[PDB]
């Protein structure tokens, strides 16, 4: 459905004539990654965020332009991955665990 919205919606012509229509993701502060599926774009965006090209707000807004409101769970991924790293740290230091 993310792709069925990305590529299968048509504006209201009356508000196109009067100059009222503005779509987001055509205004974002940056550009969106292009791919064959949305999921790939989502992954590239998480990757950009983890790097530092994207802030938290821009990452969330891009997720909204992509998926709508069913992508809020992913607003924390960075933090989550951080915590996962911490686990490995302990598991990489227990001497008997090897």
């Amino acid at each position: 459905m993310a792709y069925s919205k990305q590529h299968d919606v048509k504006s209201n012509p009356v508000a196109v004539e009067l100059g009222l229509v503005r779509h987001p993701s055509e205004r974002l502060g940056f550009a969106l990654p292009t791919a064959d599926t949305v999921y790939e774009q989502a992954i590239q965006l998480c990757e950009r965020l983890m790097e530092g090209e994207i802030d938290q707000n821009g990452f969330e807004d891009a997720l909204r332009c992509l998926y709508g409101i069913h992508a809020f769970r992913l607003y924390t991924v960075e933090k989550l991955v951080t915590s996962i790293i911490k686990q490995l740290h302990s598991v990489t230091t227990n001497r008997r665990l090897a």
Binding site: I69, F72, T76, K79, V81
Partner: protein, 237 residues
């Protein structure tokens, strides 16, 4: 949610302009009947003309509201008295004044429409998002190791209690499922990007963690080693 509230304020201002203009236009619509009667009668009748207490319409409250708004409530009694008493003198004056005020208000409304448009677009999309901000906290207190181990221990204790109740309690408390075999390669990709672009650990720690993750993931989930290579680098210098 502050974004729903911004939307509600905007809708309130919109409504304000619209209600003033609409009431004024209804009154004008009334006067436009008496004017066109006036201009179609002899010159002596115009002097002996009077309007009843309801100005010839159905709903006097709108009309008195309009007049009090336009002329202030200090000069409105004079205008209503002269509109009832001698119409043929008082209707043209008031009608023209109302037309001028309508013109001005329409101009102002057309001026404000654009500012409101941009405010609405700035506030709108993150308003169907009640749970987007009430989650950066619950996820925290569900990612604490303390919470994890506490939950585990409570599960074990209540399951032992049910085991001593004579009930049927299974062996495992958690049942996870991993169907797609590729998502793990994607999580590996994320791991590698973090490790390289994390400002917390040292190069050798990332290296050890990378090799260990390679081995452990490839082995536990039974996914080919070769897929994990591009995302988990062996040398971090």
């Amino acid at each position: 949610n502050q974004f729903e509230e911004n939307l509600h304020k905007l809708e309130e201002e919109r409504y304000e302009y619209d209600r003033h203009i609409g009431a004024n236009m209804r009154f004008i619509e009334l006067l436009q009947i008496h004017a066109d009667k006036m201009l179609k009668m002899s010159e002596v009748e115009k002097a002996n003309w009077t309007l009843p207490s309801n100005l010839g319409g159905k709903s006097v409250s709108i009309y008195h509201k309009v007049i009090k708004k336009v002329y202030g409530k200090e000069h409105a009694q004079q205008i209503i008295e002269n509109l009832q008493k001698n119409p043929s003198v008082t209707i043209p004056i008031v009608l023209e004044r109302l037309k001028k005020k309508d013109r001005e208000w329409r101009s102002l409304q057309n001026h404000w429409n654009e500012l409101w448009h941009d405010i609405e677009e700035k506030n709108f999309y993150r308003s169907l998002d009640h749970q987007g901000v009430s989650f950066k906290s619950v996820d925290k207190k569900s990612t604490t190791p303390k919470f994890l181990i506490s939950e585990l221990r409570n599960l074990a204790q209540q399951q032992k209690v049910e085991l001593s109740e004579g009930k049927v309690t299974p062996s495992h408390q958690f049942l996870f499922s991993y169907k797609d075999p590729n998502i793990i390669t994607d999580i590996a990709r994320l791991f590698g990007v973090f490790l390289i672009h994390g400002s917390t650990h040292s190069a050798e720690d990332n290296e050890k963690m990378s090799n260990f993750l390679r081995s452990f993931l490839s082995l536990f989930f039974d996914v080919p080693y070769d897929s994990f290579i591009p995302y988990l680098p062996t040398h971090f210098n």
